[PDB]
């Protein structure tokens, strides 16, 4: 029972880590395109 609980927690943490990894990749891309430069793709760096 305890190992099944730990494995479920580890798997859920891995899925959440994948979601955070995608969010961090988006944040790095936003830092490179919007902060490090000027972005001509609309709505990538806010409305307008």
């Amino acid at each position: 029972g305890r190992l099944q609980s730990l494995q479920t927690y580890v798997t859920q943490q891995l899925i959440r880590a994948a979601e955070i990894r995608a969010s961090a990749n988006l944040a790095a891309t936003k830092m490179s395109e919007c902060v490090l430069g000027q972005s001509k793709r609309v709505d990538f760096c806010g409305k307008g």
């Binding site: 099944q4 609980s5 479920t8 859920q12 709505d43």
Partner: protein, 48 residues
């Protein structure tokens, strides 16, 4: 114990995420724009 309340929470998160996904994809307009009554588009046909 809490194994399946955890499972119910996970399913609830999936459903909420699906609603958010649809809203993010389609609700990109603050106002509902309405097509003009006359289709005078310079010869471009949008009836389809």
């Amino acid at each position: 114990g809490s194994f399946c309340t955890q499972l119910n929470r996970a399913l609830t998160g999936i459903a909420v995420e699906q609603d958010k996904n649809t809203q993010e994809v389609f609700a990109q307009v603050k106002q509902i724009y309405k097509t003009p009554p006359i289709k005078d588009f310079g010869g471009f046909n949008f009836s389809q």
